[PDB]
Write a protein that binds this ligand. Structure first.
Ligand SMILES: [Mg+2]
Ligand SMILES: [Mg+2]
Ligand SMILES: [Mg+2]
Ligand SMILES: [Zn+2]
Lengths: 101, 134, 143, 213, 130, 55, 149
RNA sequence: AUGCCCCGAAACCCCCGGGCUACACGCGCGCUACAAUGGGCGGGACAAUGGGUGCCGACCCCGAAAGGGGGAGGUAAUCCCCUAAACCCGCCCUCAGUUCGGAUCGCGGGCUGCAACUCGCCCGCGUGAAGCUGGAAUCCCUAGUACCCGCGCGUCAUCAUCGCGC
């Protein structure tokens, strides 16, 4: 109970699904319910710039862009699983945050 | 029993609900009879006048819309209302008349705006500045 | 009772126009100051100006000559805080341009920066002048 | 203005809910298969026809008329005197105002003559459409102005355009309105009067078209 | 109309007046400047006007602070400014209080025009550069 | 003091308050979401900062 | 019937009429000298420009629920004609609105929900729906299609 | 980033005040108009992209307006910017240099700033210039595209007639 809430957020999309399915399976193997990964809106940061150092020539621009995929998981609290999700060993380009309600 | 359909028109969505009643129809709470820009009131009464004052008096419809403007939501309403009427009565000698008069009453419109490009970029994709020789 | 030409404090005003526009002509009374005085006096701003009996002209002339004491507030007045005395005043045609003229001469005396521009007939409020403000006549080189 | 007309509900699939194009009758065999007169309650097609060759054949005549008054005037070619560039106060995209002026135009026409306004309109768009033209054909090195024949569709386009421009020059800096100046043009053209602009342009085209056959 | 009255108050009637009661008799800009305190340099300059007002400092007052707001202390004496290259005298009189110090020391030489040259018009641009 | 005549002043706004973290110039500096670089250095370091160009 | 059953302008015109009899609604001391917002150019023209504003404010908290002062200033703004420069949208003043809301509170039609703005009372709903029905009982003669609902 | 040649108690490093904002004049790109296919006053309608911890400010209360004194909730599909304008209904104006057009100037109240004169921006009353459709010439556009109307980021302690998007 107290329904922990975990929030993953990373820029590589693939390397997120694997930690998601780890959490899903760990929950399943033991006895606990869970709300599947709820996709939250992507946050894409965009930066428009000119292209030439000097000021001569026509004006042509760039569009750099960086996308950040998020998720959200709701799960109960059993120490058999509350612990089981501690040896999960996230990758280095992912963020995780845990908190109960 | 109830039915419910949808209609989209360049950023405007419409959810309809149809069921038996006295022949009244609301839109966001407004009665259809009170829509001020007459050219947008005659736009959502074409399905309900092309079916006749007999079917139009045995149903209640009530839609909800959001987005767009006074003419990009009238057409959403019309699409949803046509798609609902073609199921309640559920015939085809009426569905046919919904393709001779206007084919889009059932297939909708696949058109959206087009992004802007860098020469003015606040006026449109193809409009540019004014050339200056000499 | 109808008339065609009436006069109040100098400039004479038409008689087939509404009362609020008929007063606009008096140099010193715009449109937003006319609505005010017509309201404070006690009569409509839509009555035909020719229908002004003369005691009402006396009323209007009273008001235009010290309006602060009748209800016209002192944030809506031709000039507040008179440079010679802190009284709040509203001037009209003859007294107006003279007051501005002496407010200009005062800056001409001390030889400020805002007085010399008034001298030479140039911008006063910080504009640019490479490209506009061409109040002169073209110059040629050769052809 | 009267609340019975401000709030108006039809119960018949007519044109604008008022007039019925069941008895009008086109005389010219050339322009018959291009002037559409189907039921079509509301005149609005949302610009789907301007994608397909000969698409504008199946578009109601009232919509072809309403679209050719959504414009500012004469912007690079003088009309009876001057340019009439009127930007930011022209009705370029405002289809509501266009539909309104045409509604009132018909309401005036129906009163001063007494016929189905669309019959008067279909008379106006034949006594104003000319069927001879000019060009330049280069042949073996040189060209010279020669006379040609105008296909029907282009006849119709030119007709409606000149009616538009005729009405849109008497409401210009003059006391007369726009809806009534769209009537003092159709009642004239449909009667072959010289004082018109759409008819006079037909005569002064056909003249300098014949004189160089 | 030979005496000077600012808002109904003569000179020596306002010469003894304070500095917070004074600001109610000046327009916005100077009332606000008098309210965010004076800058350090203007402190150093007031502490040289007051001495030159009592008996001491009989020596020309100079400055770079063109921002100083003329005040009833400075009426009567003649101080200098710095218009970019040199110090220019400004004999302070009444009817200056409220204005800025640098307002009376102009900064650009009045312009008088010669004759157009090679490029002043499209008729002498390429007919010169060969 | 000979340490009072080659020492600057601590600005806190205006073009002279920030300089590029890698080149060292004042002027056209990017302040979106925090990073502080030129407009010239951000263009030849971006594909290692993670960014990509899709359109 | 309710206020959802007629057009806005007719109902507001009819409401402002009966409103003139509530002793609490009365124009302040600076009403004849004020234009309604920094985006106008001229003062209001009719003499009862007060009652129309107040009556438009009732119907505006009826079908908007908890709404606050700084949100009734976005509604009553417009586009400005600022000389040689393009047009631009601006908010409205505050006093003309704050007074209206305090006077309607003292009348007994609204109330200050704490922390979330103001809402309408039962007295106010009775007031507005009675007039809506009174009007509509005659908008169906000349429009015989409202007779249904 | 960099080779060669000059500066080397200076052409290196800091600090205060001025200039880049000067104005008989020729030109490039734009904004507002020359009115009724409109101006004013009161009511009624409907968006999307994006941004916020040195910051975004709901809600209450003072002020006529700019603004001021308090101050929840927000490290974000939660709280805030954020009830858009062209559009519609009702009344005044009736073809006039005008209730068109708002340049130019006088006086008074405020915000940011260590500092607003040279040279910042914003408000209220008053004054009311040229302009009645544009010579020879020349530019942009093939469909949700051209035209017409507003909005958001950037630059930024304040200031958008600009650039890039909706
Ligand atoms: Mg420069
Ligand atoms: Mg005007
Ligand atoms: Mg300044
Ligand atoms: Zn750099």
């Amino acid at each position: 109970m107290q329904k922990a809430r975990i929030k993953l957020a990373s820029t590589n999309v693939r390397s997120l699904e694997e930690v998601a399915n780890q959490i899903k399976q760990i929950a399943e193997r033991t006895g606990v319910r869970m709300s599947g990964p709820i996709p939250l809106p992507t946050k894409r940061i965009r930066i428009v710039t000119r292209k030439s150092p000097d000021g001569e020539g026509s004006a042509t621009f760039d569009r750099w862009e960086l996308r950040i995929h998020k998720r959200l998981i709701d799960i109960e609290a059993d120490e058999r699983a509350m612990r089981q999700i501690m040896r999960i060993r996230v990758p280095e380009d992912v963020t995780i945050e845990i908190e109960l309600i | 029993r109830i039915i419910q359909t949808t209609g989209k028109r360049k950023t405007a969505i419409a959810r309809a609900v149809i069921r038996e009643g006295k022949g009244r129809v609301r839109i966001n709470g407004k009665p259809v009879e009170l829509v001020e820009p007459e050219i947008a009131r005659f736009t959502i009464l074409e399905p309900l006048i092309l079916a006749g004052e007999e079917i139009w008096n045995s149903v209640d419809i009530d839609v909800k819309v959001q987005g767009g403007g006074f003419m990009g939501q009238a057409e959403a309403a019309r699409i949803a209302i046509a798609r609902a009427l073609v199921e309640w009565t559920g015939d085809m000698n009426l569905k046919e008349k919904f393709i001779k008069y206007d084919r889009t009453m059932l297939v909708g419109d696949p058109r959206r705006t087009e992004p802007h490009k860098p020469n003015r970029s606040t006026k449109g994709p193809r409009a540019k500045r004014q050339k200056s020789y000499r | 009772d109808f008339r065609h030409i009436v006069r109040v404090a100098g400039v004479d005003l038409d008689g087939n126009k509404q009362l609020r526009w008929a007063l606009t002509a008096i140099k010193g009374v715009g449109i937003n100051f006319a609505t005010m005085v017509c309201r404070v006096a006690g009569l409509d701003p839509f009555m035909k100006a020719g229908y002004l009996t003369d005691e009402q002209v006396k009323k209007i002339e009273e008001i235009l000559q010290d309006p602060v004491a009748h209800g016209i507030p002192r944030w809506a007045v031709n000039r507040p805080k008179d440079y010679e005395t802190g009284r709040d005043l509203h001037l009209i045609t003859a007294k107006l341009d003279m007051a501005i003229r002496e407010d200009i001469m005062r800056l001409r005396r001390i030889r400020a920066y805002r007085g010399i521009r008034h001298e030479l007939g140039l911008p006063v409020r910080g504009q640019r002048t490479r490209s506009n403000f061409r109040r002169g006549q073209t110059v040629g080189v050769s052809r | 203005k009267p609340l019975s007309e401000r709030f108006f509900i039809p119960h018949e699939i007519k044109v604008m809910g008022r007039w019925s194009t069941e008895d009008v009758e086109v005389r010219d065999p050339s322009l018959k298969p291009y002037i559409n007169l189907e039921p079509r309650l509301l005149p609005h097609t949302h610009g789907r026809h301007a994608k397909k060759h000969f698409g504008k054949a199946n578009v109601h005549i009232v919509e072809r008329l309403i679209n050719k008054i959504m414009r500012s005037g004469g912007s690079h070619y003088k009309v009876a005197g001057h340019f009439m560039r009127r930007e930011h106060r022209s009705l370029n995209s405002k289809k509501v105002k266009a539909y309104e002026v045409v509604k009132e135009a018909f309401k005036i026409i129906e009163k001063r003559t007494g016929k189905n306004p669309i019959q008067v309109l279909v008379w106006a768009i034949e006594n104003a459409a000319p069927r001879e033209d000019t060009t330049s054909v280069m042949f073996g090195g040189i060209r010279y102005h020669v006379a040609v024949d105008i296909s029907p569709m282009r006849r119709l386009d030119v007709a409606l355009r000149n009616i538009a421009l005729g009405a849109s020059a008497k409401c210009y800096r003059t006391k007369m309105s726009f809806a009534e100046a769209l009537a003092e043009e159709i009642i004239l053209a449909a009667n072959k009067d010289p004082k018109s602009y759409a008819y006079s342009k037909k005569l002064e085209i056909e003249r300098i078209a014949e004189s160089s056959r | 109309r030979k005496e000077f009255r600012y808002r109904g108050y003569t000179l020596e009637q306002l010469m003894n007046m304070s500095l917070e009661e004074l600001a109610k008799l000046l327009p916005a800009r100077q009332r606000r400047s008098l309210k965010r305190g004076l800058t350090p340099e203007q402190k150093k300059l007031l502490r040289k006007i007051r001495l030159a007002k009592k008996g001491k400092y009989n020596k020309p007052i100079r400055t770079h602070c063109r921002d100083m707001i003329v005040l009833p202390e400075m009426v009567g004496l003649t101080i200098y400014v710095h218009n970019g290259k040199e110090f220019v005298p400004v004999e302070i009189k009444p009817e200056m209080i409220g204005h800025y110090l640098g307002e009376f020391a102009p900064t650009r030489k009045r312009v008088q025009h010669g004759a157009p040259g090679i490029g002043a018009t499209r008729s002498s641009m390429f007919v010169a550069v060969k | 003091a000979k340490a009072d005549y080659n020492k600057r002043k601590p600005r806190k706004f205006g073009k002279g308050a920030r300089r590029c973290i890698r080149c060292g110039q004042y002027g056209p500096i990017i302040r979106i979401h925090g990073l502080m670089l030129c407009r010239h250095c951000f263009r030849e370091v971006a594909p290692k900062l993670g960014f990509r160009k899709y359109e | 019937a309710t206020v959802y059953d007629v057009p806005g302008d007719l109902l507001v015109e009819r409401v402002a009429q009966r409103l003139k009899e509530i002793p609490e609604i009365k124009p302040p001391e600076w009403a004849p000298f004020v234009k309604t917002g920094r985006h106008k150019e001229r003062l209001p023209e009719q003499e009862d420009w007060w009652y129309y504003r107040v009556a438009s404010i009732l119907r505006r908290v009826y079908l908007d629920g908890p709404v606050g002062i700084e949100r009734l200033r976005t509604y009553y703004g417009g586009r400005k004609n600022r000389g040689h420069a393009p047009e631009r949208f601006y908010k409205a003043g505050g006093s003309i609105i704050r007074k209206a809301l305090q006077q309607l509170e003292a009348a007994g039609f609204v109330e200050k929900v704490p922390g979330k703005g103001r809402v309408i009372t039962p007295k106010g709903r009775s007031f507005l729906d009675k007039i809506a029905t009174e009007l509509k009982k005659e908008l169906e003669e000349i429009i015989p299609e409202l007779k249904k609902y």
